[PDB]
Chain A
Amino acid sequence: GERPPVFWLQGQGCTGCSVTLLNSVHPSIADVLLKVISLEFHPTVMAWEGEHAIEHMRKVAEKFKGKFFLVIEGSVPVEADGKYCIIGEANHHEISMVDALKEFGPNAAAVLAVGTCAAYGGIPAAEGSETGATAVSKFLGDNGIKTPVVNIPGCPPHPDWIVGTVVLALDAIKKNGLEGGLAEVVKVLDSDGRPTPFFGRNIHENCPYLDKYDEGVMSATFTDKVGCRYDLGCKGPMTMADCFERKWNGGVNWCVQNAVCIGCVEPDFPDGKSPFYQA
């Protein structure tokens, strides 16, 4: 196996999707970086900087045109001619996220929209915003760019959803080639672009407190772990994720055990899941 080149571009992100990836257990992030992918551009962790880092990405992109994977973290703001997200400068000219996605988007093998912001707009697109924050797939489509997009949402996603999707795609490509493998990846996506291995089961239907929900036994304070969390605001009933089973951070907790689910993987997050602390 040969580690494919990956560029990780951040738009209107919080870097939470990079940090969650650093928490991957099996494989560890060291193994991902040294054995699974070749992370050629990533502003948070790479050695080089500035125009030199941009030029390096461009040189790899030219050499591996059609073959590199493009990870997008954050939404893409279109208002004000892209000025709400400037990601770099080269040749004495600023590079907006709009510009960058139009440059690299057409030439990637596939775009992985990591996190709810990139997948669906997320908090930057929520009520009260004014930057034109746009989801990756919509931005690409609006600009005539047909490159396949896989959504890996969550705010943040679990590391296993990101790494697992990368591995699923690379394994499909090993088996059926680039075009055939990407066609197989698209077949495992739901109607919101999400891989069904991680997003095909509903939290509530699989929740350990479902018996209490059915019995009408509800907690009135967060620290009462006996009752169902519905009255405290749990959005498990309308959320598709496998958190009930893999849990978070090495299996030590998850949102429903600790507090409530806020529906962070869903296309309407946050506004359609708010208020968070009532039903």
Chain B
Amino acid sequence: GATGRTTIAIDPVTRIEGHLKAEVVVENGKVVDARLSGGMYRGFETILRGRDPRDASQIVQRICGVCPTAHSTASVLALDEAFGAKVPNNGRITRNLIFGANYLQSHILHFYHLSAQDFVQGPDTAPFVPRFPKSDLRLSKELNKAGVDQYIEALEVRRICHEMVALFGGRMPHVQGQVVGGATEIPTKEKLVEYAARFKKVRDFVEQKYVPVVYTIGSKYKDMFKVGQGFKAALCVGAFPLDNSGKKHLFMPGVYAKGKDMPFDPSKIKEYVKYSWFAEETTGLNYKEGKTIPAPDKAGAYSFVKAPRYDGLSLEVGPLARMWVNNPELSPVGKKLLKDLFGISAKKFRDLGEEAAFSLMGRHVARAEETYYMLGAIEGWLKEIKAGEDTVVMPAVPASAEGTGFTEAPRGSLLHYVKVKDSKIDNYQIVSASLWNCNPRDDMGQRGAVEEALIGIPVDDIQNPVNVARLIRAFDPXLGCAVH
């Protein structure tokens, strides 16, 4: 160690999904180094081997019960390619309705049930107490009460989102309704009425309560737009196909780094393991050649998360990444509240500016704006879907094949790669969103995205170091996804 440098370890980091330890070094009241450790491993990539490939679209969902529809989607897209299946148009749209509804669930869950206690004092009973004696909770009595009331209402709203998922997905968590070849249940006129009625309630909550409260709370934490920048580099791999030719997507792919936009080339992804608990000979592999050989005793390693890099770059993923890459128009309420509460004149997302967008609070804003954006996408799919039109084909299992499915989980880019040999899974490799965010150093010593975003985070009180986990929560981590 060194005089003036104080180490803080937080394990478990709570109000995230899954098992994470954060270790930071604080000097002069700011984080100067960071290490993130994903401490739980299951090994889905080896569990999957030898199975009927169709089983994958059920097995993979159990990577993560918060974002199972993302894994389902990536898996069925990979299987569609491997099997040569042409998903019927109406099944493409049904898939988008199943998965889009979980974007609404997941963002609402994240802001209210995971993040809002960073800023809101809950009722005086467990699990809302005890907490840090100096929790830095700045809201007025009235705005804090609105936060609590909305937390409670959001418990109902996120449940309704899962009813929306289940209408054509069968149940949730863990849908039955997406398979290779499309979706297993044709939407009926009656069940589309049920989906739209629930959607209207979610839409109203998002527009009237959620998006406004994020900007309003953010306006009491303006300092949190000035920290958490990290590398200011982002990835999007595309998601929600809008046609049957694989071209247009709701979120279009791209990479942003060092102030430059560039296309996404998946051959530039490699996964490093020097600082991860996997065998040394497996380092530096693109996912098509990926290998998962655990090495829990390997010297120097500190995580079960591999370290993915994009042409050597350490990138982040998630709502901020997608909204930055795609640069949509901001919501009406966001444009007004940016002006009224912050003095910011903005029309498109990038009008926030790089510094404020790539910040702790900027990532919460991006997630709220994306939730509003998804409302319009779901409205479009409700207009486009046709009651009664077939949604599935029934392809046979190929003897030998490969496929890759790319999508955007609520927390960021997700791909699944499958290689089939003798009609069974020969290899299955997963590169997930919180893997891109919450990974350790690579073989070159370059930190992961959240590790780097922690640098500079203020810790004026080592005994109440609340901003360390606040920064982490802005990325909405799920370590089940990250490690699998």
Given A16-B68, A129-B43, A258-B170, also A275-B185 (CB < 8 A): no
Contact with A along B35-57 (1 / 0, CB 8 A): 00101111110111111101100
Which of the segments B345-353, B387-395, B441-449 contacts the partner chain?
B387-395
Contact B65 A14 (CB under 8 A): yes
Contact A46 B14 (CB under 8 A): yes
Contact B47 A155 (CB under 8 A): no
With a 10 A CB-CB cut-off, give which of B44, B63, B127 has the most chain A CB atoms.
B127
Which of the segments B15-23, B281-289, B373-381, B413-421 contacts the partner chain?
B15-23
Residue in contact with B184 in the complex, picked from A25, A128, A259, CB distance below 8 Å: A259
Contact A156 B21 (CB under 8 A): no
Interchain nearest-CB distance for A267 vs B (Å): 16
Contact residues in A for B125 (Cβ distance below 8 Å): 34, 38
CA gap between A51 and B130 in the complex, in Å: 13
Contact residues in A for B15 (Cβ distance below 8 Å): 44-47, 49
Contact A253 B169 (CB under 8 A): yes
Given A84-B41, A129-B47, A259-B179, also A22-B170 (CB < 8 A): no
Within 8 A of B (CB), among A194-228: 220-223, 225
Contact residues in A for B114 (Cβ distance below 8 Å): 44-45
Given A14-B65, A47-B130, also A277-B55 (CB < 8 A): yes
Which of the segments B157-165, B216-224, B256-264, B265-273 contacts the partner chain?
B157-165
Contact residues in B for A85 (Cβ distance below 8 Å): 19, 39-41
Contact B42 A39 (CB under 8 A): no
Contact A255 B176 (CB under 8 A): yes
| A279 contacts B by Cβ under 8 Å | no
Contact A252 B41 (CB under 8 A): no
| A170 contacts B by Cβ under 8 Å | no
Contact residues in A for B162 (Cβ distance below 8 Å): 23, 249
CA gap between A277 and B18 in the complex, in Å: 30
Contact residues in A for B50 (Cβ distance below 8 Å): 127-128
| A188 contacts B by Cβ under 8 Å | no
Contact with B along A27-41 (1 / 0, CB 8 A): 011100110001111
Contact residues in B for A48 (Cβ distance below 8 Å): 14, 130-132
With a 10 A CB-CB cut-off, give which of B12, B37, B109 has the most chain A CB atoms.
B12
Residue in contact with A17 in the complex, picked from B9, B41, B65, CB distance below 8 Å: B65
Within 8 A of B (CB), among A237-276: 248-250, 252-255, 257-260, 262, 264, 270, 274-276
Interchain nearest-CB distance for B35 vs A (Å): 13
Interchain nearest-CB distance for B18 vs A (Å): 7
Contact B66 A15 (CB under 8 A): yes
Within 8 A of A (CB), among B443-478: 469, 478
| A94 contacts B by Cβ under 8 Å | yes
Task: Kindly report which residue of chain A lies nearest to residue B135, judged by CB atoms.
Answer: A47
Interchain nearest-CB distance for B33 vs A (Å): 18
| B296 contacts A by Cβ under 8 Å | yes
CA gap between A40 and B128 in the complex, in Å: 9
Task: Kindly report which residue of chain B lies nearest to residue A50, judged by CB atoms.
Answer: B10
CA gap between A34 and B50 in the complex, in Å: 47
CA gap between A249 and B392 in the complex, in Å: 23
Contact B184 A276 (CB under 8 A): no
CA gap between A242 and B128 in the complex, in Å: 34
| B437 contacts A by Cβ under 8 Å | no
Count residues of chain B with CB under 8 A from any CB of chain A: 86
Contact residues in A for B327 (Cβ distance below 8 Å): none
Contact with A along B125-158 (1 / 0, CB 8 A): 1111111100000000000000000001001101
Contact A49 B173 (CB under 8 A): no
CA gap between A70 and B163 in the complex, in Å: 29
| B430 contacts A by Cβ under 8 Å | no
Within 8 A of B (CB), among A108-136: 122-124, 126-131, 133
CA gap between A54 and B21 in the complex, in Å: 13
Q: DSSP majority for the A interface?
A: loop
| A138 contacts B by Cβ under 8 Å | no
| A18 contacts B by Cβ under 8 Å | yes
| A175 contacts B by Cβ under 8 Å | no
Task: Kindly report which residue of chain A lies nearest to residue B177, judged by CB atoms.
Answer: A258
| B248 contacts A by Cβ under 8 Å | no
| B361 contacts A by Cβ under 8 Å | no
Contact B297 A223 (CB under 8 A): no
Task: Kindly report which residue of chain B lies nearest to residue A270, judged by CB atoms.
Answer: B59
| A174 contacts B by Cβ under 8 Å | no
CA gap between A88 and B46 in the complex, in Å: 26
Task: Kindly report which residue of chain B lies nearest to residue A79, judged by CB atoms.
Answer: B296
Residue in contact with A274 in the complex, picked from B39, B55, B66, B170, CB distance below 8 Å: B55
| A171 contacts B by Cβ under 8 Å | no
Residue in contact with B169 in the complex, picked from A43, A123, A258, CB distance below 8 Å: A258
| B294 contacts A by Cβ under 8 Å | yes
Contact with B along A47-75 (1 / 0, CB 8 A): 11111111010000000000000000000
CA gap between A194 and B248 in the complex, in Å: 49
Q: Which positions in B face A, CB cutoff 8 Å? A: 9-19, 21, 37, 39-44, 46-52, 54-55, 58-59, 62-66, 68, 109, 113-114, 117, 122-123, 125-132, 152, 155-156, 158-159, 162-163, 165-174, 176-177, 179, 184-186, 191, 194, 294, 296-297, 304, 390-392, 394, 469, 478, 480
Known: A22-B158, A80-B296. 20 other contacts (CB 8 A): A16-B64, A16-B68, A16-B173, A16-B174, A22-B155, A34-B125, A44-B17, A45-B114, A50-B11, A53-B14, A85-B41, A88-B11, A126-B47, A129-B42, A155-B174, A252-B166, A252-B194, A258-B170, A258-B185, A259-B177
Ordered nearest first, which 4 A-B pairs have the shortest CB separation?
A16-B65, A258-B170, A86-B39, A249-B166
Q: Which positions in A face B, CB cutoff 8 Å? A: 5, 10-20, 22-23, 25, 28-30, 33-34, 38-54, 56, 77, 80, 83-89, 92, 94, 122-124, 126-131, 133, 155-156, 220-223, 225, 248-250, 252-255, 257-260, 262, 264, 270, 274-278
| 21 CB < 8 A contacts A-B | A12-B40, A20-B173, A22-B159, A39-B126, A46-B126, A47-B14, A47-B131, A48-B130, A48-B132, A50-B12, A51-B9, A124-B43, A129-B47, A130-B46, A223-B184, A250-B159, A253-B167, A255-B171, A258-B168, A258-B176, A270-B55
